RNA sequence: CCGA
DNA sequence: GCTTGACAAGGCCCGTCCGTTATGGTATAATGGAGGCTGTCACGGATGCA
């Protein structure tokens, strides 16, 4: 569907339970994971309450219950009365999530051990003190009533608390430890009262205190605008990811391939069930206190492994990948699967040089082209009445036929193809070409587009991509075709220009050479006369040649406009001499003729320019 | 000397003396009751014969191992019960005659690791500008590190590996030394007594209580046992032989070498040196100097892994003795060999040091065994690799080659041992030098082999100084290196000189002729490409070489070398028989068309005939990239440095068809295919001839069991092994149900699972070995039978193949011309290859023109020259004068005077093959030695329409082996965004990856010729949404429409 | 582009907040039409990493760098992403708005 | 999972199957469609066709038998014969 | 050091990240400078006096810095010493002056 | 480990 | 264009039947853990300490 915006917030326990709970027609919710079992070892089926359970997450097969008896497709939207598994398609295990109901409150490690550690900001305490209370190393005073030596949010050791028990003072003094104390401290904080106290405190305070008051006030003002409670930073319910995002597949050899998220959830469920067992049978407090600290360290390793304490490792002391580790890095979800993907209808090969081949044309190998254009060939083989379905078309494509090559030749005509060479440092690293079928295995590249790709022919490979839609073919032709990409986008200067052999060939063609002077100083009646004399073998390539040429757009090295000498002729005619020109003009208002000293190679160069441009 | 002598000497030291030290530090063990004692007799340990040899272990995917039996003896403390029994202790893989190991059917080498040597090291770190403060570090072979400190006030602070700083007087009184001998041992007691007051002076009992307060109920007996267990106990602290040697050397002690523990005299001497360094006497150490770095080969690493496994084994034996109250056991019941086998298998399988072997050619095989890597366990981390550890040190001169190094991210980390280098008994690299007396190079006896004893002491000259024969060093200035500085001195002050001008370089760099006329990066590229050449069908020796080719071919191990004098009596293509004379027939087996690790050929050919005398050391058979007993990696072909019609434009290569029809550059590649008939829960997989949906003539090459025969031709898609598996779901859609209602069509219970040839990969079947458990074999568990198929193919030269010379001049063939179109010489001979002349002066590899001109002179003479590098010691312009003089002498032949022109020396006239006209300028022709590399176009071409997908992301896979797609990374997305092209980018991200309904709809619309519909939400975004929800974040998408907000369901 | 706020008089802009100067000027004019006391500011210069993380979109800032901190401050501030830019529509799967 | 090629092949097979079946008599076409679930997604027995109609299940088996015999004709039915694997 | 892009590109990165270099000292008003130097033996302090105010400002200078001012009309953000300028101080000086 |  | 009767085939369904599986227990005395770092560099906050 369509949506307009995405909003992020803090999840309440009722919202986490709302993601996981699903009701049955009998009147029973099924969303809670209570056992750390995954699948049965004998038959490879998921267990009836666990991390892969079919009552919570859905069936493993399409339209089939767990216990049997509903194997057909005809029972749709029904729930089995014996087992409890809804007879649905098996792709709901990508979406359906569950939850774990904790026996003790736990803190989210993102809000405690981050920077700037919003829990200690909102609680107005130091980070080491809150980290000492949460991990059961110190107490805190929740009720400071009837004491002068005790105050609110004051930390005590175990010795200081057992020596307070000497006085049994003579009133009700409460203490707390763990995330229960933090949840009770956050639950009794009146947000509007602390906000108006901070606004009444900032106007009359010091300099460095005021920045801390501004930071606490701007943290507190977010909790009133979002209408979220401060005690939601401590977790009572833990959401469980769907089982198809933590898959457990079997390799050829009998060994199972698991993901690291199953071990972390298994540790959380094991320590939760042991904590419930210890609280049921009234164990001593040193054993129940170590079990709550271990559950606290288990939830933190599932969320962010190695953020606070020791990193939980696996088999070869490799750290387990957690819920933030699968998204937070350059191998995470954003940089590896969302901003860049692997694509269909693509291939690659080594590149060779492509002379006697135009620009906007790439040489595409034939065995590469039957694979990339396979559904377009399959469509044409049915439209021409050769075959009738996809199976006969695929059979004739793989078996080899001379009909397939003519079909592919008439299919790839006018279909542009994008070429790419890594690294793609700028825009000209992806350009579109019109393919022609070459024989061999390398891709033939035109030599003028090689500085745009930074590509030479000593081992470079290029990827090939085929646009499918008609909007995608019109965009490859009108916006990305290689004959429209002459100018750079960084400067205004042309990228497509001769280089490294055409420059040397044009330098040799138009140079001066005193050794090769055959027929030097001869007079010719224009450009075509000297071009005919060169192909007849009359002159050399660097001979000094006078050319009758009436145009005045002549540019030379160190351009001359001054007259060297003048020889006067009869009938009022002046013969003006230049360094590389000879102009005969009339007396008053006319020019008669003009000769230019040049080489035949310069004449070849200018004839090439003139027949290339004016057409 | 041999070139793989470090591998051979280290494994011989392990088999002779290294394991005995572990078995002697092992014994004896005892129980906690003190009534049983088990001790291992290590000196008489036995080795069983291997179950299979080299080739039968290679083809069975097994190891080449021996069984190791250590005889034990159980003595009894209640009565005179002596129980002696041979006990199996583990499986040790044996080093082959080439210096390699065979682990799971693959050849493997254990590369040499360079680490910091044990001993005491001092450094001088400082503040902003602050005080010159000095710090010590005592490094053992194994155990805790003892460090020392000085601050700006001057406090001597000692610390253990991770702890905070405490005082050296507290450590010294914690040992048990008197305060008398502490300040009576020191040279300057006034500096130490300054720290005595601020830190205080404890008693012997008062000091033991305050280390336990810092290292960890503070007790003195617990801290005494703690420090006795850290530094002074065996089997928890080993200083090592090299550590004792270097610590006696630095601190000038004559302590006995048998003591391998730390003593308080050593700590007193280290305190004395650290205090004396604050009064400007003594020398601070260098961490990158090759006197402080040693090489650990395969003996030490096996010794350490066996130590760890024996620690586990004796823990198991002590637990089994302490639990069992009943006595009178057998020694074979108390020994569990499984941790030692597990440790040895872990070391040989999953180590950074145990590397998959480079077996492309003999040069790559020889170079891989001499690699010196700084990475690994106990070495370095690539993230902790700065610039100074990748720099070239002056102590590397002669010992480590400055040229040969990787070009990738591990540049400067993995080095190569130089040619004349050698590792001594303590692990340090030494180089031979000739003595120089009164300005005369001595050269009378063996050289000295200085182990970096030549920096602070000797003036060493290189081996390219001019010197008249049987005489002094000519010239009044000799270039020397001294105190890690280059300088020039008189010849009467020179102490040592090098023995060879190629002492600075490795073997593959010494293969390059005219090396001093090339750039160093191009020499690196030439060495790297020389290690990547494929062995050709008819190998040929170079017309210009250097001289190390025969020794490289002898020490690679691909050459059958004779051992005795004798007369060869019988030679065929598989066997050479010779009776020795100076159990009277030596049979040398000759291997025929075996497969290397890189799918190349390992073939040997006989050279000797029947009935001729044979000297020991004579080459009897030569290998795949070897002919005439010398290394032969490529062929000699006729070059012309000229541009064609854009066909050698930007390092492209134009060749002729003569290199195709004359079988030049034709190589053999053998591929290997393996299939297992596994055991499934639904039934056993069987290998059969009856396959469903397979026609009539697709089974001609299969035998009666469904397997191909030897000598059959296979192409892409042909069946190699027919296999079926019993599918058992049988969930058919209504379309298939109606189509089987109409036309009969009984659906079978098995499905096709046959082994087929991949796309391409045609060839001939040469080996169809089948392994079955009831034939005597034993398999991986869960597999009934295993079939292994070897397919060989002859690959000719092709457009798109890579081609290179010895000077870093690579290139891709882009056109193959006929010989009537190739340019030709004034005797009518056409050119084999045209190279672009613009690739020479920009890349600055001038030695290829020297090599081609000298090879062409040797072609016109017929002499096969050999020139050592750095030949300018014999005069100015020596290479140029040699080349042009030999070209003149080749042109003085009675029929060949067109070979050399005195007006333009290196060039002659070349005619065009198409028109007959000569080119306008003379062209440099020659005979170059070109190579064919492993990078062929058949292994590079790949294409995908639609294949498999990933598990969670549901995006296409990657890789050629799994029909994967190309990655359209983030830079390509930026390039498409810098254009317009919003629709190309949208179809690249949705209907070509991880949108399954869009995939099906796009394929159906293309096949039926209609418009492709609009895509939906991609699959990986929903995965990200579920992951962010499972982290505990209430993230949701919303939609606004006519004054209404509603949460949208993206899972739909 | 940005500016730092101090003297937060009669405005919903606490000190320390990085706002664009055009937005502070629009708020100052549209509250100076009511004759109220405006907000002072001092201009700041950010680097290319701090200006990338101080954008209005948490999806782009989370996909760029420091995903945990950006997602924590976005979850506590309760902010919305209105999908205005090239990087968000690539992640969503839509046509880019260029 | 199932490839997009198998999806498009079975969809073209479904379209060609419906276009072949709607050429014969309208009664036998829907009998064959309700028999194998080409419209309901539920394969039914012979009697429940007799409750869709009221004529009982013995005529239904003869109807589907002669419909299969008409679709098994060699002439004008080989468009579906290429899907034979 | 050597001149190539390996040494020029860290300058680009520290310019685009708006970092602060080690040595920098700019003016804080727009005065009319007249140089006074008595002894250059590792002790130089630059004297400069304004036009509008009676109280003058003379920026003190530690010995490793030098002087580039030879006498001109010094404006607000002018650089008096040698060293890499930081744009934070330029923005601060201009805003605090105007 | 190598290639661009 | 249907209809009734014979001949079998095969899913549901409720008994035993034996292999698997969960659970409880064992009585000399035993009472604080092995096990690696120790060669990267630079910047920005956040303590923390004199
Ligand atoms: N670590 C590397 C190495 C190489 N490249 C790419 O590969 C090309 C390497 O070109 P190559 O042909 O290997 O070397 P040249 O620069 O052409 O030099 P030469 O002709 O001497 O080989 C570079 O332009 C670069 O774009 C890269 O992206 N990353
Ligand atoms: Mg290249
Ligand atoms: Mg190149
Ligand atoms: Zn059921």
Give the DSSP per-residue string, B390-456: TSPPGGGTTTB-SS---SSS-TTTEEEB-SS-EE-TTS-EEB-EEEEETTEE--SS----BSS-SSS
Q: Which partners does chain A have (≥3 C-beta pairs < 8 Å)? A: B, C, D
Q: How many CB atoms lie within 10 A of CB A53?
A: 25
Interatomic CA distance for residues B134 and B144, integer angstroms? 21
**Is B786 in a helix, a strand, or coil?**
strand
Cα–Cα nearest to B687, from B639, B730, B725: B725
The answer, for C92 touching chain B at a CB cutoff of 8 Å, is yes
What is the distance in A from the centroid of ligand 1 to the CA of B839? 15
The answer, for D2 touching chain B at a CB cutoff of 8 Å, is no
- Comparing CB atoms, the residue among E17, E87, E88 nearest residue C48 is E17
Interatomic CA distance for residues B101 and B113, integer angstroms? 17
User: Token pair for residue B675?
Assistant: 């299939």
Interatomic CA distance for residues B636 and B627, integer angstroms? 14
The answer, for D13 touching chain A at a CB cutoff of 8 Å, is yes
Binary contact (E19, C46; C-beta < 8 A): no
**CA D79 to chain CA centroid, nearest Å:** 15
Cα–Cα nearest to D30, from D38, A204, B248: D38
- Comparing CB atoms, the residue among E17, E87, E95 nearest residue C42 is E95
Contacts of B996-1003 with CB under 8 Å at 24 or more apart are B996/B954, B996/D4, B999/A344, B999/B946, B999/D4, B1000/D4, B1000/D7, B1000/D8, B1002/A468, B1003/A375, B1003/B946, B1003/D4, B1003/D5, B1003/D7, B1003/D8
Compute φ and ψ for C10, nearest 5 degrees: 65, 20
What is the distance in A from the centroid of ligand 3 to the CA of B649? 12
What is the distance in A from the centroid of ligand 3 to the CA of E4? 20
Closest listed ligand to the CA of B838: 1
Q: How many CB atoms lie within 10 A of CB A565?
A: 8
- For A297, residues 6+ apart whose C-beta sits below 8 A from its C-beta are A135, A309
Interatomic CA distance for residues B557 and B631, integer angstroms? 12
User: Token pair for residue B1003?
Assistant: 């394929």
User: Token pair for residue A290?
Assistant: 């170590």
Q: Are strands B652-656 and B810-817 parallel, antiparallel or unpaired?
A: parallel
* Mutate-to-test residue for ligand 1 from B810, B836, B935, highest number of ligand atoms within 8 A of CB: B810
Cβ neighbours of C75 in B, within 8 Å = 1033-1034
Minimum CA distance residue for ligand 1 atom 28:
A423
Compute φ and ψ for E2, nearest 5 degrees: -75, 150
- Comparing CB atoms, the residue among C71, C86, C94 nearest residue B977 is C86
Pocket of ligand 1 (CB under 6 A): A 423, 454, 456, 458; B 843
Binding-site residues of A, please? 65, 67, 80, 83, 456, 458, 460
* Mutate-to-test residue for ligand 1 from A422, A426, A458, A459, highest number of ligand atoms within 8 A of CB: A458
User: Token pair for residue B920?
Assistant: 């306008």
What is the distance in A from the centroid of ligand 1 to the CA of A460? 9
- Comparing CB atoms, the residue among D10, D12, D71 nearest residue B733 is D10
* Mutate-to-test residue for ligand 1 from A351, A420, A423, highest number of ligand atoms within 8 A of CB: A423
Residue of B nearest to D39 (CA): B734
The answer, for B814 touching chain C at a CB cutoff of 8 Å, is no
Q: For the sheet containing A566-568, what is the strand order?
A: A523-524, A545-548, A591-598, A581-585, A574-577, A566-568
Beta bridge partner(s), residue B431: B450
The answer, for D73 touching chain B at a CB cutoff of 8 Å, is no
Residues in reach of strand F, judged by a CB distance below 7 angstroms, are: A 422-423, 458-461; B 355, 358, 373, 406-408, 410, 414, 528, 532, 810, 935
Q: Are A480 and A432 in contact (CB under 8 A)?
A: yes
Interatomic CA distance for residues A204 and A201, integer angstroms? 6
* Resolution value (Å, 1 decimal): 3.0
State the smallest CA–CA distance between residue A221 and chain C in angstroms: 9
DSSP summary character for residue B373: E
Interatomic CA distance for residues A282 and B217, integer angstroms? 31
Q: How many CB atoms lie within 10 A of CB B848?
A: 29
Interatomic CA distance for residues B250 and B270, integer angstroms? 9
**Is B473 in a helix, a strand, or coil?**
strand
**Residue A35, CB, less than 7 Å from strand G?**
no
What is the distance in A from the centroid of ligand 1 to the CA of A456? 9
- For B718, residues 6+ apart whose C-beta sits below 8 A from its C-beta are B698, B701, B756, B757
Q: Are strands B942-944 and A591-598 parallel, antiparallel or unpaired?
A: unpaired
Omega of the bond prior to B181 within 30 degrees of 0, cis?
no
* b/e B980-1006 (16+ beta carbons within 10 angstroms → b): ebbbbbbbbbbbbbbbbbbbbbbbbbb
Q: How many DSSP H helices and E strands does chain A contain?
A: 21, 21
- For C4, residues 6+ apart whose C-beta sits below 8 A from its C-beta are C15, C16, C17, C18, C41, C42, C43, C44
Interatomic CA distance for residues A445 and A464, integer angstroms? 12
C-alpha distances (whole Å) from B134 to each of B149, B158, B187, B250, B276 are 7, 12, 17, 16, 10
Cα–Cα nearest to A289, from A178, A138, A133: A178
Binary contact (A338, C59; C-beta < 8 A): no
User: Token pair for residue E12?
Assistant: 């680009």
Q: How many CB atoms lie within 10 A of CB B820?
A: 11
Cβ neighbours of A216 in C, within 8 Å = none
Interatomic CA distance for residues A311 and B108, integer angstroms? 34
What is the distance in A from the centroid of ligand 4 to the CA of A92? 18
Interatomic CA distance for residues A432 and A477, integer angstroms? 7
Cβ neighbours of B1039 in C, within 8 Å = none
Interatomic CA distance for residues B6 and A496, integer angstroms? 56
Q: Are B577 and B565 in contact (CB under 8 A)?
A: no
**Cα angle A448, A453, A456; round to 5:** 70
Q: Are strands A443-445 and A346-353 parallel, antiparallel or unpaired?
A: parallel
Cα–Cα nearest to E26, from E72, E98, E71, E91: E91
- For B506, residues 6+ apart whose C-beta sits below 8 A from its C-beta are B367, B370, B401, B403, B404, B416, B417, B418, B419, B527
Binary contact (A344, B1034; C-beta < 8 A): no
> In chain E, what's the furthest Cα-to-Cα distance?
50
Compute φ and ψ for A534, nearest 5 degrees: -75, -40
Q: How many CB atoms lie within 10 A of CB B534?
A: 27
- For B1004, residues 6+ apart whose C-beta sits below 8 A from its C-beta are D7, D8, D11, D12
Cβ neighbours of A3 in B, within 8 Å = 1037-1039, 1048, 1050
Among B678, B966, B1043, B1051, the strongest candidate for a mutation testing the A interface, having the largest count of A CBs within 10 A, is B966
Q: Which partners does chain B have (≥3 C-beta pairs < 8 Å)? A: A, C, D
- Which of the nucleotides lies closest to B139 (Cα–C1')? G38
User: Which experimental method was this entry solved with?
Assistant: cryo-EM
Interatomic CA distance for residues B911 and B909, integer angstroms? 7
Task: Tell me the Ramachandran region of residue A164: left when phi exceeds 0, alpha when psi lies from -120 to 50, beta otherwise.
Answer: alpha
Residue of D nearest to B948 (CA): D3
Range of the domain at B272: 116-296
Q: How many CB atoms lie within 10 A of CB E68?
A: 11
Cα–Cα nearest to B548, from B504, B513, B499, B498: B513
Q: Are strands B496-498 and B485-489 parallel, antiparallel or unpaired?
A: unpaired
- For A341, residues 6+ apart whose C-beta sits below 8 A from its C-beta are B955, B967, B968, B988, B989, B992, B993, B994, B1020
Binary contact (C77, A221; C-beta < 8 A): no
Binding-site residues of A for Mg(2+), please? 456, 458, 460
Interatomic CA distance for residues A68 and A56, integer angstroms? 17
User: Token pair for residue C78?
Assistant: 């309760």
C-alpha dihedral sign at A18, A20, A24, A29: negative
Q: Are B873 and B465 in contact (CB under 8 A)?
A: yes
CATH of the domain at B162: 3.90.1110.10
């Amino acid at each position: 569907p369509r949506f307009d915006y995405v909003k992020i917030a803090i999840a309440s326990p009722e919202r986490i339970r709302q993601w996981g709970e699903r009701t049955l027609p009998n009147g029973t919710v099924v969303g809670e994971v209570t056992k750390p079992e995954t699948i049965n070892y004998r038959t490879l089926k998921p267990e009836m309450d666990g991390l892969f359970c079919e009552k919570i997450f859905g069936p493993s097969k399409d339209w089939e219950c767990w216990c049997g008896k509903y194997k057909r497709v005809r029972h749709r939207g029904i729930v089995c009365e014996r087992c409890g598994v809804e007879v649905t398609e098996s792709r709901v295990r990508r979406h359906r999530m569950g939850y774990i109901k904790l026996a003790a409150p736990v803190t989210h490690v993102w809000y405690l051990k981050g920077i700037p550690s919003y829990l200690s900001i909102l609680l107005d305490m130091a980070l080491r003190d809150v980290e000492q209370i949460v991990y059961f190393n110190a107490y805190v005073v929740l009720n400071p009533g009837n004491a002068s030596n005790l105050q609110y949010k004051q930390l005590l050791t175990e010795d200081q608390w057992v020596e307070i028990e000497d006085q049994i003072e003579l009133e009700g003094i409460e203490v707390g430890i763990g995330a229960e104390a933090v949840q009770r401290l956050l639950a009794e904080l009146q947000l509007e009262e602390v906000a108006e106290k901070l606004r009444e405190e900032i106007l009359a305070s010091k300099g460095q205190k005021r920045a801390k008051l501004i930071k606490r006030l701007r943290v507190i003002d977010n909790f009133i605008a979002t209408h979220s409670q401060a005690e939601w930073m401590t977790l009572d319910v833990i959401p469980v990811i769907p089982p198809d995002l933590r898959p457990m597949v079997q390799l050829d050899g009998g060994r199972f391939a698991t993901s690291d998220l199953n071990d972390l959830y298994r540790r959380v469920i094991n320590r939760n069930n042991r904590l419930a067992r210890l609280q049921e049978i009234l164990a001593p407090e040193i054993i129940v206190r170590n079990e709550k600290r271990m559950l606290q360290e288990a939830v933190d390793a599932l969320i962010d492994n190695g953020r606070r304490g020791r990193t939980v490792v696996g088999a070869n002391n490799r750290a387990l990948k957690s819920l933030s580790d699968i998204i937070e890095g350059k191998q995470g979800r954003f940089r590896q699967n969302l901003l860049g993907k692997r694509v269909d209808y693509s291939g690659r090969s080594v590149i060779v040089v492509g002379p006697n081949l135009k620009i906007y044309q790439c040489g595409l190998p034939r065995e590469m082209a039957i694979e990339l254009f396979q559904p377009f060939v399959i469509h044409r083989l049915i439209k021409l009445g050769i075959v009738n379905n996809i199976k006969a078309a695929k059979k004739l494509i793989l078996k080899g036929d001379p009909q397939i090559w003519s079909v592919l030749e008439e299919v790839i005509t006018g279909h542009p193809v994008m070429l790419n060479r890594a690294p793609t440092l700028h825009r000209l690293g992806i350009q579109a070409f019109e393919p022609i079928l070459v024989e061999g295995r390398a891709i033939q590249l035109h030599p003028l587009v090689c500085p745009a790709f930074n590509a030479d022919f000593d081992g470079d490979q290029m990827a090939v991509h085929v646009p499918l839609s008609l909007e995608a073919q019109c965009e490859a032709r009108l916006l990305m075709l290689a004959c429209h990409n002459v100018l750079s986008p960084a400067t205004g200067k042309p990228i497509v220009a001769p280089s490294q052999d055409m420059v040397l060939g044009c330098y040799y063609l138009t140079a001066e050479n005193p050794n090769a002077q055959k027929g030097a100083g001869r007079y010719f009646a224009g450009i075509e006369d000297a071009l005919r004399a060169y192909d007849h073998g009359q002159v050399d390539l660097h001979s000094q040649i006078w050319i009758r040429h009436l145009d005045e757009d002549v540019v030379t090295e160190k351009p001359d406009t001054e007259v060297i000498k003048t020889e006067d002729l009869g009938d009022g005619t002046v013969m003006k001499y230049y360094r590389e020109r000879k102009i005969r003009e009339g007396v008053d208002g006319e020019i008669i003729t003009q000769y230019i000293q040049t080489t035949p190679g310069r004449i070849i160069y200018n004839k090439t320019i003139a027949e290339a441009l004016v057409f | 000397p041999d070139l793989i002598e470090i591998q051979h000497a280290s494994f011989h030291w392990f088999l002779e003396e290294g394991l005995i030290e572990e078995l002697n530090s092992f014994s004896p063990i005892s129980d906690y009751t003190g009534k049983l004692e088990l001790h291992f007799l290590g000196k008489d340990y036995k080795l069983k014969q291997p179950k299979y040899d080299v080739d039968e272990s290679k083809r069975r995917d097994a190891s080449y191992s021996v069984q190791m039996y250590v005889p034990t003896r159980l003595i009894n403390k209640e009565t005179g019960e002596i129980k002696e029994q041979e006990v199996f202790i583990g499986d040790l893989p044996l080093m082959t005659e080439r210096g390699t190991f065979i682990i799971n059917g693959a050849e493997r080498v254990i590369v040499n690791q360079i680490v910091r040597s044990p001993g005491v090291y001092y450094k001088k770190e400082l503040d902003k500008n602050g005080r010159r403060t000095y710090s010590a570090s005592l490094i053992p072979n194994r155990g805790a590190w003892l460090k020392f400190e000085t601050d700006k006030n001057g406090l001597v602070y000692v610390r253990i590996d991770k702890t905070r700083k405490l005082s050296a007087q507290v450590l010294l009184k914690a040992i048990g030394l008197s305060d008398n001998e502490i300040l009576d041992s020191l040279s300057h007691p006034e500096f130490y007594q300054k720290t005595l007051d601020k830190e205080g002076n404890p008693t012997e009992e008062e000091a033991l209580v305050e280390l336990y307060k810092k290292l960890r109920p503070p007790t003195v007996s617990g801290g005494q046992q703690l420090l006795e267990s850290r530094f002074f106990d065996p089997k928890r602290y080993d200083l090592g032989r090299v550590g004792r040697y270097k610590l006696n050397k630095k601190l000038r002690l004559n302590e006995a070498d048998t003591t391998r523990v730390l003593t308080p005299q050593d700590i007193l001497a280290a305190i004395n040196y650290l205090i004396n360094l604050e009064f400007d006497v003594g020398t601070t150490d260098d961490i990158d100097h090759l006197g402080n770095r040693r090489v650990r080969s395969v003996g030490e690493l096996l010794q350490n892994q066996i130590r760890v496994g024996l620690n586990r084994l004796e823990r198991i034996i002590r637990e089994r003795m302490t639990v069992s109250e009943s006595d009178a056991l057998t020694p074979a019941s108390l020994v569990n060999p499984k941790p030692l086998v597990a440790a040895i298998k872990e070391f040989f399988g999953s180590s950074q040091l145990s590397q998959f072997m480079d077996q492309t050619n003999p040069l790559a095989e020889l170079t891989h065994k001499r690699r010196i890597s700084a990475l690994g366990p106990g070495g370095l981390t690539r993230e902790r690799a700065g610039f100074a550890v990748r720099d070239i040190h002056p102590s590397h001169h002669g010992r480590i080659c400055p040229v040969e190094t990787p070009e990738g991210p591990n540049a400067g980390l993995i080095g190569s041992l130089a040619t004349c280098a050698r590792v001594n008994d303590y692990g340090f690299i030494e180089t031979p030098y000739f003595r120089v007396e009164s300005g005369r190079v001595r050269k009378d006896l063996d050289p000295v082999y200085l182990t970096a004893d030549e920096e602070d002491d000797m003036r060493v000259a290189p081996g390219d100084i001019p010197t008249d024969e049987e005489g002094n060093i000519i010239g009044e200035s000799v270039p020397i290196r001294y105190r890690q500085e280059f300088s020039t001195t008189s010849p009467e002050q020179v102490d040592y000189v090098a023995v060879s001008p190629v002492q600075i370089i490795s073997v593959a760099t010494s293969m390059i002729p005219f090396l001093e006329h090339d750039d160093a990066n191009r020499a690196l590229m030439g060495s790297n490409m020389q290690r990547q050449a494929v062995p050709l069908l008819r190998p040929e020796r170079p017309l210009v070489g250097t001289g190390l080719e025969a020794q490289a071919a002898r020490d690679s191990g691909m050459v059958i070398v004779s051992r005795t004098h004798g007369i060869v009596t019988y030679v065929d293509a598989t066997e050479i028989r010779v009776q020795p004379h100076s159990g009277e027939e030596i049979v040398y087996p000759i291997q025929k068309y075996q497969r290397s690790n890189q799918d190349t050929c390992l073939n040997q050919r006989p050279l000797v005939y029947a009935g001729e005398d044979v000297v020991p050391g004579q080459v009897l058979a030569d290998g795949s990239a070897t002919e005439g007993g010398e290394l032969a990696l490529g062929q000699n072909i006729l070059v012309a440095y000229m541009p064609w019609e854009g066909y050698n434009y930007e390092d492209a290569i134009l060749i002729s068809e003569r290199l195709v029809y004359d079988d030049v550059y034709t190589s053999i590649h053998i591929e290997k295919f393996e299939i297992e008939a596994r055991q499934t829960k639904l039934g056993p997989e069987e290998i059969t001839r009856e396959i469903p949906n397979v026609g009539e003539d697709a089974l001609r090459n299969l035998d009666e069991h469904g397997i191909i025969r030897i000598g059959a031709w296979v192409e892409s898609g042909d069946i190699l092994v027919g296999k079926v598996t019993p599918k058992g779901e049988a969930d058919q859609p209504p379309e298939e149900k109606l189509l089987r209602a109409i036309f009969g069509e009984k659906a079978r219970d098995v499905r096709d699972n046959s082994l087929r040839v991949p796309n391409g990969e045609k060839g001939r079947v040469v080996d169809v070995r089948v392994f079955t458990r009831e034939k005597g074999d034993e398999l991986p568990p869960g597999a009934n039978m295993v079939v292994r198929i070897y397919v060989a193919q002859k690959r000719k030269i092709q457009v798109g193949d890579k081609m290179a010379g010895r000077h870093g001049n690579k290139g891709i063939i882009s056109r193959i011309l006929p010989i009537e179109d190739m340019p030709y010489l004034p005797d009518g001979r056409p050119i084999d290859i045209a190279l672009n002349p613009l690739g020479v002066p920009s890349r600055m590899n001038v030695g290829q023109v020297f090599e081609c001109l000298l090879g062409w002179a040797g072609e016109n003479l017929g002499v096969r020259f050999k020139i050592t590098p750095f030949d300018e010691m014999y005069g100015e312009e020596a290479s140029r004068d040699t080349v042009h003089g030999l070209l003149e002498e080749a042109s003085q032949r009675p029929n060949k005077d067109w070979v050399f022109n005195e007006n333009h020396p290196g060039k002659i006239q070349v005619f065009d093959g198409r028109t007959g006209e000569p080119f306008d300028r003379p062209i440099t022709v020659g005979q170059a030695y070109m190579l064919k590399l492993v990078h062929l176009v058949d292994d590079k071409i790949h294409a995908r329409s639609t294949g498999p997908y990933s598990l969670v992301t549901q995006q296409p896979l990657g890789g050629k082996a799994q029909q994967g797609g190309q990655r359209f990374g983030e830079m390509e997305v930026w390039a498409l965004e810098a254009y317009g092209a919003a629709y190309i980018l949208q179809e690249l991200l949705t209907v070509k990856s991880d949108d399954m309904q869009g995939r099906n709809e796009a394929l159906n619309a293309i096949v039926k010729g209609k418009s492709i519909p609009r895509p939906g939400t991609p699959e990986s975004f929903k995965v990200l949404m579920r992951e962010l929800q499972s982290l505990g974040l209430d993230i949701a998408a919303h939609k606004v429409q006519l004054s209404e907000d509603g949460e949208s369901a993206d899972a739909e | 582009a940005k500016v730092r706020i101090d003297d937060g008089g009669d405005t919903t802009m606490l000190p320390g907040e990085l706002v664009e100067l055009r937005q502070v000027e629009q708020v100052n004019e549209a509250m100076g039409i009511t004759g109220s006391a405006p907000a002072r500011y001092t201009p700041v210069l950010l680097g290319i990493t701090k200006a990338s993380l101080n954008t209005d979109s948490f999806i782009s800032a989370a996909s760029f760098q420091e995903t945990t901190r950006v997602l924590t401050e976005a979850a506590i501030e309760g902010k919305s992403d209105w999908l205005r830019g090239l990087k968000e529509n690539v992640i969503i799967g839509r046509l880019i708005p260029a | 999972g199932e490839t997009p090629e198998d999806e498009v092949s079975k969809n073209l097979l479904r379209e060609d199957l419906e276009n072949v079946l709607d050429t014969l008599s309208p009664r036998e076409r829907d009998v064959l469609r309700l028999r194998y679930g080409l419209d309901d997604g539920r394969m039914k027995t012979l009697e429940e066709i007799g409750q869709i109609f009221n004529v009982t299940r013995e005529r239904i088996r003869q109807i589907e038998a002669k419909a299969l015999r008409k679709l098994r004709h060699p002439n004008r039915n080989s468009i579906l014969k290429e899907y034979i694997r | 050091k050597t001149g190539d892009i390996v040494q020029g590109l860290p300058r680009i990165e520290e310019l685009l990240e708006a970092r602060k270099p080690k040595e920098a000292c700019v003016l804080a008003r727009a005065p009319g400078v007249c140089q006074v130097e008595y002894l250059e033996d590792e002790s130089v302090d630059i004297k400069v006096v304004e036009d509008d105010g009676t109280v003058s400002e003379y920026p003190l200078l530690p010995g490793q810095n030098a002087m580039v001012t030879d006498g001109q009309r010094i404006d607000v953000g002018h650089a008096l010493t040698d060293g890499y300028n930081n744009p934070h101080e330029i923005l601060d000086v201009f805003f605090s002056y105007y």
